Each structure stands twice: as C-alpha cells, then as structure tokens.
Amino acid sequence: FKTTPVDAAFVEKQKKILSLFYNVNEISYEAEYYKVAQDFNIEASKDCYTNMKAYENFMMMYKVGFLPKNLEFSIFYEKMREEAIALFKLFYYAKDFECFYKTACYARVYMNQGMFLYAYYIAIIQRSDTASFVLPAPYEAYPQYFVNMEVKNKMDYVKMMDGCLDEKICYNYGIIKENEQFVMYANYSNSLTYPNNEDRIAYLTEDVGLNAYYYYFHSHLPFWWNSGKYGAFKERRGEIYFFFYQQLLARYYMERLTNGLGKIPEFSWYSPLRTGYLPPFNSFYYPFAQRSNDYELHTEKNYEEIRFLDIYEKTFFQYLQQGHFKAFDKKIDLHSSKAVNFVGNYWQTNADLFEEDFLQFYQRSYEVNARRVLGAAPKPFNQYTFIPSALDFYQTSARDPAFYQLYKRIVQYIIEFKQYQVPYTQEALHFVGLKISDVKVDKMVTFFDHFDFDAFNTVYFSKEELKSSPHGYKVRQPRLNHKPFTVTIDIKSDVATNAVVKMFLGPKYDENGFPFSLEDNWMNFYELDWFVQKVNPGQSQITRSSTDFAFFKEDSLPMAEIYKLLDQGKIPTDMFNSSDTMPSRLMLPKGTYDGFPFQLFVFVYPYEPTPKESEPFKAVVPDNKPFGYPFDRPVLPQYFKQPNMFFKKVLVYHEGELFPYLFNIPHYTPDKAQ
Amino acid sequence: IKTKNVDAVFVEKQKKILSFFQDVSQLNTDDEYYKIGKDYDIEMNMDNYTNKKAVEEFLKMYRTGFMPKNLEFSVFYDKMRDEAIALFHLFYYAKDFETFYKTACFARVHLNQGQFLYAFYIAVIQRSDCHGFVVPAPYEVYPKMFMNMEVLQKIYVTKMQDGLINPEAAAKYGIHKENDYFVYKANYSNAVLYNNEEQRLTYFTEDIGMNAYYYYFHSHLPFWWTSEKYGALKERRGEVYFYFYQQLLARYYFERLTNGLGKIPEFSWYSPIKTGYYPLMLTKFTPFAQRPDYYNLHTEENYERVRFLDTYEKTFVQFLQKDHFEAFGQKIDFHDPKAINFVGNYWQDNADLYGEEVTKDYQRSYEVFARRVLGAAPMPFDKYTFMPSAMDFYQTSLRDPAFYQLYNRIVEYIVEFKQYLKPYTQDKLYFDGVKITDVKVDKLTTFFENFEFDASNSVYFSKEEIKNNHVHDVKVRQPRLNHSPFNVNIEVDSNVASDAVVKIFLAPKYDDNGIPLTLEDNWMKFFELDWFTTKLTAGQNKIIRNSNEFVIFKEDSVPMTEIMKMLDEGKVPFDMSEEFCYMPKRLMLPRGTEGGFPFQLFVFVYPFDNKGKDLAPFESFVLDNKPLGFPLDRPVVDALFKVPNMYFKDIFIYHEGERFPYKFNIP
Ligand SMILES: *[C@@H]1O[C@H](CO)[C@@H](O[C@@H]2O[C@H](CO)[C@@H](O[C@@H]3O[C@H](CO[C@H]4O[C@H](CO)[C@@H](O)[C@H](O)[C@@H]4O)[C@@H](O)[C@H](O[C@H]4O[C@H](CO)[C@@H](O)[C@H](O)[C@@H]4O)[C@@H]3O)[C@H](O)[C@H]2NC(C)=O)[C@H](O)[C@H]1NC(C)=O
Ligand SMILES: *[C@@H]1O[C@H](CO)[C@@H](O[C@@H]2O[C@H](CO)[C@@H](O[C@@H]3O[C@H](CO[C@H]4O[C@H](CO)[C@@H](O)[C@H](O)[C@@H]4O)[C@@H](O)[C@H](O[C@H]4O[C@H](CO)[C@@H](O)[C@H](O)[C@@H]4O)[C@@H]3O)[C@H](O)[C@H]2NC(C)=O)[C@H](O)[C@H]1NC(C)=O
Ligand code: NA
Ligand code: NA
Ligand code: NA
C-alpha cells in the first residue's frame, strides 16, 4: 500500500498520459484527445521531431496507409512490425512532451487500436521525460487478452441488457452489482481449453500478473530495438535473455513440482507435439487457432519453416563444435567474455546481433518462426489479417504450454554452450573471514485471494456514455498469494566489510523422491532477493522481510485508484520504481497442507562496486558479477560447501481452499486463510 | 497370531506337504521323498486313482517326454501347460493322501521343479482331503521372482564366498549376518531406475504381497480348469472375474491418485505403446525381456497375433451391437445381469466358456496372446525355450504397467455391457424406516515398515553340505506399506427390530483436477472393504467396526519355519488355512500424504433375510443373492440412487514417518 509524492505539474501531465487508455476500443467525439487530434496537422509537423528521417519514413508509409482499425495487430508479422516501429520512432523522437502528446492523440484517433497501444506503451517506457510516469496495468489496457471468453461474453450480455434480467438469477451466474459497478467472478479454464494434465496449473499460466510480467519484459527491451539507449548495457543484453527465461522456467518448474507434474517435455520439428491447447479467445474475424493434442508439426504448411528452424539450431551446434569462428562480421570465441552476450542475441535474433539500429524485415528470426509453427494457425490471409494464437502476443504467450516448451529448448541450448565457461573455483567463491552460522525462516504459506480489475476496455459504450469515460465492468478472480515472512541470517565475521547478500529458492527432490544434486539443480533455482549490508566484525544477525525482496512487487492499482491518488498528489511507488518485476503474489509456488519441501539458498560475498548501470530493467547488483550469480553457469558442487553459503530446507504450506474454483461458487462461503 | 488346533494325524500330513516347498532346486538323495520317488510305479498303482482316463493320458504324455529340468516353466505356453495340467490331474484323482503324496514324490524326483510346484500348489488347494491344509506364501516358494537381480546376485556372491569376507564392507551394501541368517536389504526398482512416471508406484506394484495375491487368485481358480468343484459358484464365475479385476484396478487407481498420476493409459494394437517396463530379474538362461517406451506393437512378428486380438475384441463389440445373440452354444441376453457370467468367461476364455473340464489348445486365449505381445519378448526359440517377461507368470504380472493397462481395457469392455442393465431403483435400495444419521472414522494413517521373508529356496548347496544339514539361510528385508488400525462408527436410527447387512466402500473424493466425483460415472472406482450383518434394534443404534475385522483382507503369511514350529504345538495359522486368496490387510489403504489426502467412505445398510436361525459368515453371503459389489455392480443414477440408508463421509489418508522406502535401506 506504499506511495510517493508528486506535484501538480506531474499530476496534470500524468493525467494526460492516462487519458488515452479510456475506452480504447472506441472514440469519444467529445474528448480532449479528439480535439488535439483534429487540430494536429501531421503533414505540417516535420518540426515536432528531432529526427527528420524517421518522420519522413512515417509520412511515407502513411501516404500508402497502415493497418486498418479492427484488425488484430501483432509484432510478429512483418509489415505491421515496420509500421509499429515507425509509429514508435515518431513517439520517441518527438522533441517535447507537447509534441509527443499531440502525436499520441493523433494515433489514438486515426490508427489501429492495437498498434497504437503497443507503441504508446513502449514510447512512454522508453522516452527520457516520460519514464518515471506510471502506466495502467497491461490487463486493464488489454482486457481482451486477460479475460477468458466465458466472462468476456457474460460482459457483452450484461452491457446489452444494461444490467441483469433478474438480480438473483445472475447472482447464480456469478454476476454482482457492487457500488454501482458490475463484478463478474471468473474461474480458470476447463480441460476444454487445457485438454491434458497441464490444466492442473491454469491458475499460474492464466494469471494476469504473470502475463503482464512477460509483456513488461518485452516492452522494456523489444527484440527489434537496439541497445543504444542503455549504453554499456548493450554488452550485457544476451546475458539478460538467458537470465530472464532460465529464471522464469525455474519458477514454472516449481509449480509443476507441487502439482505432481514433473519435467517440461522435449519435442521435435519432425514429430507430433503431444500437448495441445485451445486458446479461449477470439479476434474481430477469427476464433483463435486451436492446437489439439498430438498435433503434427511436420506437414506441408510447415515444411519450409521447419527447414529454417532446424538449421538455425544446428548451426548453433556447429558454433559449439568449432570454438572460434567468424560469424556476423565478428570473430568470436566462446571462452571470451563477449560470448554470453553473443549466444543470447543469436537465439533472440536481436537488432544487436546485426548492424541494426532497428531490425530489418528480411532477417529471419527463430522465435518468430517457432511461434508460427507451434501456434498451429492456418497461414495468414493477407499481411494485415492473420489467425491469432496465444503465441502471437506477449500478453498471452505464457498461457500456452508450448511457450515453456520452446524457451526451455532455447535455454537448454545455451546451457549446452555453458560447458565452454570456466566453473567457479574454490577461493573464487570463498569469502575470507565470513561464515553463515545459521539461517532461520518464518512460516512460508501460500493461499488464494480474490483480485479485481476493470475490464471496461473490452466492453462497448453509447455515444452518450462515452462522455463520462465509463468504466463499470470488473473481473474478480482468485489469484495465488502468500503471507509475508522473514528470513533471519546468523553471521560471524573477522572484519568489517561490505557484503552482498543473495538468497535463491529452488527444488529439494526429484519426482522420484531423490535429493537433486547441484550439478543438475543449478538452473532450477530462482533469485528471490539481493542486497548490500555493512557487516561488522563479530557475530551479527541480518533480518530480511519478504516485503523488501528485490525481485518482487505489489499489485498494480487500477487506473481509478491511480487517479484518486493523484487527486491528493501521490503515485503508487511500485508502479513508479519497478513495474517490470514479478508480482509478489507469485513469489512462492502453491504449497500443500503437508508443507512442500524446497531449498532456500543464502549466499554472502564481498561487495565490490562498479559505476552504476543505466538500466532497462530490474536494478541488479552494482557488480561486475553476472546476472544470477553464482548460479549463472554449471557448478562443481564441492566448491559449493563454503562457510558463506547456506542451503536450508524449507516447507511451503497452504491455507484455506486448495483450488481457486471453490471461491466462485454462488452461496458457498470458502475457507479463507487468516 | 490367529491360530487353530490340529490332531497329530493332520500334523504328519501337513509336514509331508511342506517338505516339497523346502529345498526346491536340488534333490536330497538320502531323503525319504527320493527313495519313494525314484522307483514308484504309477502303472502298477492305476487302481488307486479315481479316473483311469486321466492317469492313462498322463503315462502316455510322460513317456513321450516332459519339459527338461533346467528350463523355466510358464503356464502360458501350450505344451508346458498341458504337461502341467496332466500332472495336476494325476495329483487330483489320487485315491487318498498316501497316493497323492507318493505321486508328488515321483514328480519332484522326475520332473522340472517349476512345473512340479505349479501343479502341486494347485493340487493342494483343490483337493477336498486337503481343505484345511496350508501352503507357504509364494514368495518363499519362488523367491527369485519376488526380488530384483541386484539382491539375487548378492545372495549368490555370499554363498560362493561361504560367508562375508569383510563384514564392514558388506554393510555398505545392505548385507549383514544375523545369527545364522544372511540378511539382504532390498530397494524397489526405482531406487536404481526411474525410466518413466510409473516408477512412482513401485512400492505397490512390486510389493511381494500384491504379487503373491494374484498368484493365489490364479491357483484357487485357474483359467484352464472348470469351476465344477464349487457347484453353484460355477454359474457366478464370470462375475468373480470382473469383480476381482474391477476391485484390483480401483485399488491401483487409488495409488495412482496419491502419486499425482491419474487415469490408466489406453493403447492400440496398431500403434506404439507409450509405457515401457524394464524388468530387473533373470533366469538361469536369460534375462526377462524389456519393453522400451514407445514400443511398436505392430511389427512383422506380431501381425498375425494382432489380427487375432483385434478380432477377439471386434467379436465382443458385435455382441454389444445385438443385445441377444447365440455364442458358444448359449443364448445370451445383455439385459440380463446374470449374463456377466458369460461375459467374464468370454474375456478370460476359460473352461466354463465351453462346457468343458479343461481348455484345449485350439481354444486360443485372448489373455495369453495379449500378454505375449505386450511382453515385447522376441519369438520363443522352441516350445520350452522362450524369453520370459513379467506376464509369463502370475508372481510377476503386477510389476508391469502394461498389466493394468490390459485388464483395464478388458474391464472397460465389460462395463460397456453393464450399461445394458436397468439402474437400481429407489425402492430396490430403500431400507424402510432405517437411517444412517452419522458415520465417524478414526485416524486413517499409513506408514512403511521393514518386512523380512525367507529367501533360502534360492540358494544352491553341496552334496557334502546337504547330508550335513549345514545352514546357509537367507532373509530379504524391505519396507512394505502398512496402516494403523481404525474404527468405523456407524450411527443408525432403526424404526424397528430388523436384521441388516452393512457394507463399506472406499472411493476417491475428486479426480486429479479437483472435480468432485459423481457416482454416475465413478461407481466402478469404488473399492469394497467390508460386508457384515447386524441386529438392529428400535430407536438409536451404533455399530463399531474395526479394520481388523474387515472381512475382505488377510494377515501376512507366516514363514515356513514358524509354521513348522506351530505344528509341534498342534497349532496352525488361521488366516493361511482358510483366508489365503484375499488381499493382504496392510495394503488396504493407498499411501496417504503427510497433510491428509482426500478420499470418501460409502456406508450402506440394507435388509437381511432373517434366517429365522443363527448365522455363520460364509453361507450368510450365499443366502442373500445380491450380486458381488452390491449396490455398485452396475451404473448408478445419482438422483435415483441416494437414500436414507446410505452415507458418504469425506475422509483423509495421512502418512506418518519416512515417506520414501529407500530411506529404510540406507547404510
Ligand atoms: C467482404 O469481403 C471483401 C473481400 O475481402 C471485402 O472487400 C474489401 O473491402 C475492403 C474495404 O473494407 C477493401 O480495402 C479498401 O478498399 C479500397 C481499395 O481500393 C482499390 O482500388 C484502388 C484504386 O482506387 C487501389 O489503390 C487499391 O489497390 C485497391 O484495389 C481502399 O480505398 C481502402 O483504403 C482505405 O482504408 C485504408 C486502410 O484499409 C486507409 O489506409 C485509407 O485511407 C482508406 O481509407 C482499403 O484499401 C478491399 O479492397 C476489398 N477487397 C477486395 C478483394 O476487393 C469486404 O469489405 C467484405 N465485406 C464485409 C461486409 O466484410
Ligand atoms: C466456478 O466453477 C465452479 C466449479 O465448477 C462452479 O461451481 C458449481 O456451481 C454450480 C452453481 O453455478 C453448482 O450448482 C448448484 O449446486 C447446488 C448444490 O446442490 C446439492 O444439493 C442438490 C439439491 O439442492 C443436489 O441436487 C445436488 O446433487 C447437490 O447435492 C444446488 O443447490 C444448485 O441448485 C440449482 O439447480 C438448478 C439447476 O439444475 C437451478 O435451476 C436452481 O434454480 C438452483 O440454482 C446448483 O445446481 C455446483 O455445485 C458447483 N460445482 C462444484 C464442483 O462445486 C462455479 O459456479 C463457477 N463460478 C463461476 C463464476 O463460473
Ligand atoms: Na494466420
Ligand atoms: Na509445458
Ligand atoms: Na487401458
């Protein structure tokens, strides 16, 4: 519930930014943004931009025309990408906030909804003056991607009937009036959307924050954008790539573990993919593409793409087999520091992997092609109209099990390369004159909580209604969550030093009930937190609350609540400092009444600062150390018995109901955690 | 513990019986059985057998030649089977104990030991003079088939070495000498191999009791032999078949649930089968065959087998397409629940399917060939020479996921028939003026405990060592599942003095997604725990039933040496004398979880036929002719079904202590 103060100039500018997220699916002919848009003469505005070549480029594509309103926009299709990147460059190179805003009002009014939102979200995140301003949560901007079609439909019907037929009847269908607004209860999906064991974890993969999280990841550093803005970070880009996915997959594999699901399965482009998924969405023209269980990847429609994909991976194998090779106009050694970066950019086909300021249409991307084949859609009708899968959007990608299958496949390939890195030696890890004597944690408890957000942006309003910037329509759904807990660390030091304290969470046992060995477990640990303590000689005890963990955040406030906070000169400080991290809700994987066993790994090493990175991301240790150190590479497990290391077995309990559905039953009062 | 008393005459006979289960692989030439065996002339004793035809057939077949002593007998192959059956006829039609005994002595001396034991074990069970007698648990008689080859080899090593060479070193391997037994700690197969998720269940599928259990089931009632002996039971044979599998499968499914493993996989004979089995067992000639994951059933070698199997099924599908048809000289109508008999006999292809006493080679078994193809072995060399798989033996069948997948398939087809039957109506099931007002159950808690079994029969001795009655005895110990005893307290309001039957079922609560389980489609996942009778007085009653008294389960077999001690005290074990073919008590509950895995208990009270007289258990079941598994022997309709004399209690299965069996086996 934490805030940050803000003056009137901010408030007024902020409000201007947010005003464009109102009733995104329509136009209020009475809005201020509409007057600005009408007043804006795009052909006479060359002087609004600091880059005339970008403006000229836009005006050219614009003279021929863009993606029409009402078609689905996706970053994964070439022409739409060029157009969206072009729009973004105008947003970005606008000289001023006033020029930025006029341009944004223009695009808001005259361009495809999805395109505009896409570029506007990114621009705000990216523009120097505009960063430090808050954005509505991805699910409040794009409800259509965060709301399964049962509810979305009920919403259509409720709006068409301007309320309920008879209030008791739609109490039974989970629809409520609460404070002049509607609330629809929403369950997670059937086996008619997840038609296999994967359904056990719908509550994770359909989770709105998880999905938001991935969308924020993309938006902070789009594959198509070079690193110029982040200077010295350019060097660490590929390294992020690995860390982001490795880390995400670890979090995901933990959920599997507590639902008895075991290892994410391998697959092949020459065989059928066992595990299907039926996205519960529809676009303007099309229901989303369904991928049934045992879907044949290898058919006529996909042959040429499979040829592409196969060689793409096999050339990585050739790079591993040589060790030094000239590739992409560089001479690159895989014992080199620069290697980690290369690898990452190679798999993502970055703008950085090439010359490029902005990615050339013609540089074929393994991720792009992978998502087309796994999405299982029919081939696009023309280049403005394609049949959407979940893999077509960062908002929806984490929903399809095939997503984790793809990125696990990538991560394994990079781990294959990671054999070329030099495993940390003993004195390397050994912190001289520093020992952790004990670690102690509070009770770790997961549980479920209803959570609300306003889905009004996917609901339609009348000419009259739009004047009021109407937003009646809320989705209440049980989401994972845990109680706050503290870790206390007992330390003995010879000397006063400065130390970094990192603590990770990972698995304890196989699916066979065997202890994981570190040589096989290191990729399965995810970072919870890091910080810097001045450490005194003698015995000390460091306490750390789950509330202060570096890698997690509070939920976003609805746009309504943001405005209510501006009215009293404030902003939600997590939405401010760190919108791009995992929600704290999802910090722990769902536990059991037993207590599910995991290891908390605590690690203390010497703090040796470097000049602050200017960061596209999660502020990471002001260190020359890698991301996710010391788990950034294969280990020699002997070297992990150091006195400044501590593995502590920890059990995650659960409380109240065991399944989200038990919360959305009309007339049943659930067991709520206390 | 639970015993029974026996005269010196029974004692002499019992010890004579057990002498054939003592050193099975070798012959003591000094021993009494050998002297008797070697020279005994069957021909001269022809008039000491009930059935001349049988004995003639035996002598014919025997002079032709039987299987050799070094090979591995299996009942699933024609020629070996027939030899066995003839030998069995010989044992069965013996005039008296003496002749039977003399007949065994001969066979032990002159024949393949596997064949002999198969034959003898069944004869002992099936002979009327021998009712009341006791056979040793199968894991003592055939220990090589109840342990993985790691352990077996350790046994042989220790024997070759005439003891432990470095006791401390041996202790690292779970081997130590304890008095005059050598003790081997034994881990389940997944401690050394986790090839697929099915390995999660090894403590069940390898449990020496479960496997022995199936072996008893077959021995009591072999597919090749008629149920003539059992009179009225014959008309119920099919019913017993379905019930046995449908129960076993339900119990299996429970284990699946608590390991997060869901419904039993379906296969196709025209397709590869996803679930492999890697048997860690062997024979003096060969290893058991392995079935890799995604093993293709449809290869040249199997083309004909598949045709046969496909047809066998399609044939039953056709029966289902008519409701009334003529097959195997009978007229069948699937609206008649008694047709279950025919249906069960059809699938098992048993003697009672035809009108016959024994099956014939030309009456080709669906189960035999299903087993054969699922077993994945290469084609047998000759009739006595094949590569064994776990489905060549009843001792080993439960070890292979494919076993459950096969019988699942069969059972399902049988319930496709059950759909023809009219659902029990409100007024078939009502118990007028009686009401179960409450059910309360004690703590339900599972755990593992070390269990030892005498595995000595696996050890070969010396000429010199045999006359010296030198001792090299071998025990194998491993954690086996068990549970704490518990009470079910049932509170019922009888309007009036009446005699009732109470029945107790255990069933799942949810499926693996948390969908609560509806009787309409989950009736066949109900596992029957108890069947008993009670006087019900007017007003309020309460029955207290303890899991020890549950009628459907048995105590662990006593070891031969312990039985041997009891005989010197005119004592014999009760459970082993009568109740051997039942499921062992310790396995009644699936492995719970530390926090309480959810199941449910279904109590059902219904009117008992007075008797006008006092009541005893075995005939009390036969006096009321309710079908096995009543009232859950056919599809239910939830709304038509529930009634005041029914009760459903949500229950929770906890587990205490060490959760993984290997932790017991740690050095
Ligand atoms: C039934 O299905 C048919 C076929 O799919 C649809 O017909 C299409 O209709 C769309 C309009 O919705 C047409 O696309 C638009 O029409 C014009 C095309 O002009 C043609 O001729 C000019 C020369 O005058 C050429 O330059 C050009 O190559 C075309 O062949 C354009 O005027 C439109 O431009 C407008 O919209 C764009 C964005 O789309 C803006 O950028 C512009 O400013 C401008 O406002 C647009 O291109 C399309 O041509 C039709 N297809 C075919 C094959 O004829 C029907 O719409 C559909 N019916 C229903 C009810 O859905
Ligand atoms: C999220 O998903 C969950 C899980 O699927 C849904 O929960 C189900 O919700 C429905 C309500 O929508 C439940 O259905 C109701 O069951 C009640 C309990 O009945 C018991 O007792 C009755 C006799 O009263 C027996 O017949 C029955 O077997 C049970 O023993 C009933 O009281 C309700 O009565 C209604 O019945 C008829 C329809 O046939 C109506 O016309 C009546 O007017 C009356 O409303 C009703 O049938 C069901 O139990 C829940 N399932 C589970 C597994 O718990 C949530 O609804 C869902 N939430 C959202 C927002 O989608
Ligand atoms: Na498409
Ligand atoms: Na997956
Ligand atoms: Na099956």
Chain A contact residues (CB < 8 Å to B): 191, 197, 199-200, 259-262, 510-513, 592-595, 658-659, 661
Contact A146, A395 (CB under 8 A): yes
Q: What are phi and psi of A462, to 5 degrees?
A: -75, 155
Question: Which residues are bridge partners to B436 per DSSP?
Answer: B492
Q: Which of B512, B593, B659 sits opposite A513 (nearest CB)?
A: B659
Domain's final residue, options A507, A539, A569: A569
Inter-chain residue contact A511 with B200, CB threshold 8 Å? yes
Looking at the structure, do residues A265 and A239 belong to the same domain, yes or no?
Answer: yes
The one-character DSSP state at A126 is: H
Give, for B437, the enclosing helix (H) or strand (E).
strand B436-441
Say if residue B336 is exposed, middle or buried (CB neighbours under 10 Å; 0-12, 13-18, 19+).
Answer: middle
- B518 CA distance to ligand 2 middle (Å): 13
- DSSP 3-state of B596: coil
Does the beta carbon of A187 sit less than 6 angstroms from any atom of ligand 2? yes
Residues with Cβ within 8 Å of residue B645, at least 6 apart in sequence: B429, B430, B431, B434, B435, B436, B492, B604, B605, B606
Is residue A461 within 6 Å of ligand 2 at its C-beta? no
Residues A281 and A404 in one domain: yes
The string of DSSP codes covering A64-123 is H----TTSPP-TTSHHHHHHHHHHHHHHHHBSSHHHHHHHHHHHHHHS-HHHHHHHHHHH
Q: Residue B56 has which token pair?
A: 């003639």
**Interface residue of A190, A255, A512 to substitute, partner B, most B CBs within 10 Å:** A512
Q: Which residues contact A459 (CB under 8 A, 6 or more apart)?
A: A25, A155, A156, A159, A472, A473
Check if A172 has its Cβ closer than 6 Å to any atom of ligand 2: yes
Q: What is the rounded CA–CA span in Å between residue A601 and residue A649?
A: 9
Neighbour-count burial of B214, counting CB atoms closer than 10 A to its CB (0-12 exposed, 13-18 middle, 19+ buried): buried
Burial environment of residue B70 by CB neighbours within 10 A (0 to 12, 13 to 18, 19 or more): exposed
Rounded to the nearest 10°, the torsion over CA A15, A16, A17, A21 is 80
Please state, in angstroms and rounded to a whole number, the distance separating the CA atoms of residues B68 and B84.
13
Pairing of strands A473-482, A181-185: parallel
Q: Which among B587, B550, B158, B578 has a CA at the least distance from the CA of B398?
A: B587
Give the span between the Cα atoms of B560 and B23, in whole angstroms.
12
Q: B186: closest CA among B163, B153, B213?
A: B153
The full DSSP string for A378-442 is: PPPSBTTB----GGG-TTTGGGSHHHHHHHHHHHHHHHHHGGGSPPP-HHHH--TTEEEEEEEE-
- The whole-angstrom separation of Cα B115 and Cα B65 is 13
Query: Ligand 1 centre and the CA of A114: distance in Å?
Result: 20
**Taking CB atoms and an 8 Å limit, are A197 and B200 in contact across chains?**
no
Q: Can you name the residues that pair with B553 across neighbouring β-strands? A: B583
Shortest-distance atom of ligand 1 to CA A64? 41
Cα–Cα distances (Å) from B339 to A425, A644, B320, B324, B344, in that order, read 75, 74, 12, 10, 9
> CA A584, A589, A591, A595 torsion: positive or negative?
negative
C-alpha angle B472-B475-B478 in degrees, rounded to nearest 5:
160
Question: Omega before B401 cis (within 30°)?
Answer: no
| Minimum CA distance residue for ligand 2 atom 25 | B639
Q: Identify the three-state secondary structure at position B313.
A: helix
Contacts of A15 (CB under 8 A, 6+ apart): A563, A566
Closest CA to B239 of B172, B151, B336, B327: B336
Closest to B82 (Cα-Cα) out of B351, B355, B360: B360
What are residue B438's DSSP bridge partners? B491
For residue B511, the chain A residue with the least C-alpha distance is A200
**Token digits for B134?**
């006791």
SS3 B7: coil
**Long-range contacts formed by A332-335: CB under 8 A, 24+ apart:** A334/A417, A334/A420, A335/A420, A335/A422
Residue ranges of domains in chain B: 1-187+450-480+557-570, 188-420, 421-449+481-556+571-667
Task: Return d(Cα A316, Cα A332) in angstroms, integer.
Answer: 13
User: In terms of domains, do A493 and A620 share one?
Assistant: yes
Q: What is the CA radius of gyration of chain B?
A: 26
Provide the domain limits for residue A668: 421-449+480-555+570-674
- 3-state helix, strand and coil shares in percent for chain A, rounded to the nearest 5: 40, 20, 40
Q: Is B642 helix (H, G, I), strand (E, B) or coil?
A: coil
What SS3 state is found at B325? strand
Distances (CA, A) of B181 to A67, A614, B451: 85, 73, 15
| Residue A584 DSSP symbol | G
List of chain B residues whose C-beta atoms are within 8 Å of the C-beta of residue A593: 593-596
Facing A197 at nearest CB: one of B200, B262, B594: B262
Number of domains in chain A: 3
Last residue of a domain, one of A544, A569, A594: A569
- Report residue B502: phi and psi, to 5°: -110, 140
Sign of CA dihedral B130, B135, B141, B147: positive
Whether residues A260 and B595 touch (CB distance < 8 A) is answered with: no
Elucidated via: X-ray
Strand boundaries in B223-288, DSSP class E: 272-273
Residues A520, A654, single domain; the answer is yes
In the DSSP assignment, the letter for residue B588 is S
Give A265's DSSP letter: -
How far apart CA A103 and CA A40 sit, in angstroms, is: 8
Whether ligand 2 lies within 6 angstroms of the CB of A38 is answered as no
What token pair was written down for B418? Answer: 């059950």
Q: Which of B200, B260, B595 sits opposite A594 (nearest CB)?
A: B595
Homologous superfamily (CATH) of B421-449+481-556+571-667 is Hemocyanin, C-terminal domain (2.60.40.1520)
In SS3 terms, A598-627 reads as EEEEEEEEECCCCCCCCCCCCCCCCCCCCC
Among A569, A599, A615, residue at a domain's last position = A569
User: Is the beta carbon of A68 within 6 A of some atom in ligand 1?
Assistant: yes
Residues A275 and A391 in one domain: yes
- Chain A nearest C-alpha distance from B332 (Å): 39
Under an 8 A CB cutoff, do A200 and B261 touch?
A: no
Q: Is A662 exposed, middle or buried (0-12, 13-18, 19+ CB in 10 A)?
A: middle
User: Same structural domain for residues A426 and A533?
Assistant: yes
- The answer to whether the beta carbons of residues B148 and B189 sit under 8 Å apart is yes
CA of A53 relative to ligand 1 center, distance in Å = 29
| String of DSSP letters for B182-201 | EEEE---GGGT---SGGGGG
Tell me the residue type at A114: G
Closest C-alpha to B287, from B367, B207, B390: B390
CA A267 from chain centre, in angstroms, equals 24
Instruction: Give the C-alpha separation, B272 to A406, whole Å.
Output: 26
CB atoms within 10 A of CB A603: 23
Q: Find chain B residues with C-beta within 8 A of A592's C-beta.
A: 593, 595
Cβ B478 vs Cβ B187: under 8 Å: yes
Q: Which of A117, A142, A119, A17 is nearest to A58 (CA)?
A: A119
Contact (CB, 8 A) for B96 and B49: no
The yes/no answer on whether domain B188-420 falls in CATH 1.10.1280.10 is: yes
Among B131, B175, B139, B134, CA closest to B24: B139
In this structure, the dihedral spanned by the alpha carbons of residues B246, B252, B258 and B261, taken in order and rounded to 10 degrees, is: -100
* Ligand 5 centroid, distance to B401 Cα (angstroms): 10
Instruction: List C-alpha distances in Å: A553 to A211, A213, A345, A414, A574.
Output: 14, 11, 28, 29, 6
Nearest to A17 by CA among A88, A120, A110, A87: A120
CB contact under 8 A, A510 and B594: no
Residues A232 and A273 in one domain: yes
How distant is the alpha carbon of residue A503 from its chain centre? Answer: 22
Q: What's the CA gap between B532 and B604, in Å, rounded?
A: 11
- Clarify whether residues A160 and A211 are in a common domain: no
Length of chain B: 667
Which of A200, A593, A595 has its CB closest to that of B513? A200
Element (H, E) at B531: strand B527-536
Q: Which residue of A has its CA nearest to B658?
A: A513
Q: Which residues on chain A are in Cβ contact (under 8 Å) with B200? A: 511-512
CA distance B574 to B5: 9
Query: Is B190 close to A259, i.e. CB distance below 8 A?
Result: no
B199 — contact with chain A (CB < 8 Å)? yes
- Measured CA to CA in angstroms, residue A1 lies from A4, A561, A562, A570, A575 at distances of 11, 11, 12, 12, 11
d(CA B624, CA B610): 10
Which residues from chain B sit within 8 angstroms of residue A659, using beta carbons?
Answer: 514
A77 closest CA partner among A523, A381, A347: A381
Query: Between chain A and chain B, how many beta carbons pairs sit less than 8 Å apart?
Result: 37
Interchain pair A512, B593: CB under 8 A: no
Task: For residues B20 and B36, give the distance between their C-alpha atoms in angstroms, rounded to a whole number.
Answer: 13
Q: Which two tokens stand for residue A365?
A: 């991307």
Q: At what angle do helices B78-92 and B97-110 cross, to 10 degrees?
A: 150
User: Quick one: DSSP state of residue B25?
Assistant: S
User: Angle B340-348/B303-321 helices, nearest 10 degrees?
Assistant: 170
Q: Which residues of B touch A197 (CB under 8 A)?
A: 262, 512
The DSSP element (H or E) to which A475 belongs, if any, is strand A473-482
Question: Which of the listed residues A170, A661, A663, A667 should we mutate to test ligand 2's pocket, taking the one with most ligand atoms within 8 A of CB?
Answer: A661
Q: Are residues A204 and A309 in the same domain?
A: yes
Between strands A582-583 and A331-333, the pairing is unpaired
d(CA A525, CA A159): 46
**Three-point CA angle A9, A12, A13, nearest 5°:** 85
Are residues A507 and A467 part of one domain?
no
The answer to whether residues A602 and A439 touch, using CB atoms and an 8 Å cutoff, is yes
What type of residue sits at position B664?
F
Q: B449: closest CA among B663, B190, B652?
A: B663
Placement of tokens 């039933």 in the chain: B545
Strand pairing category for A486-493 and A538-545: antiparallel
Q: Which amino acid is at A466?
A: L
CATH number, domain at A323? 1.10.1280.10
CB atoms < 10 A from the CB of B618, how many?
7
- A94 and A222 co-located in one domain: no
Residue A94 is encoded by which pair of tokens?
């606008």
CB of B521 within 8 Å of a chain A CB? The answer is no
Which of A61, A66, A384 most suits a substitution to test ligand 1, by most atoms within 8 Å of the C-beta? Answer: A66
Q: Is A63 in the pocket of ligand 1 (CB under 6 A)?
A: no
Residue A664 in contact with ligand 2 by CB distance below 6 A: yes
Residue A381, ligand 1, Cβ within 6 A: no
Mutate-to-test residue for ligand 2 from B509, B510, B513, B515, highest number of ligand atoms within 8 A of CB: B515
Nearest in space to A517 (alpha carbons), one of A526, A505, A509: A509
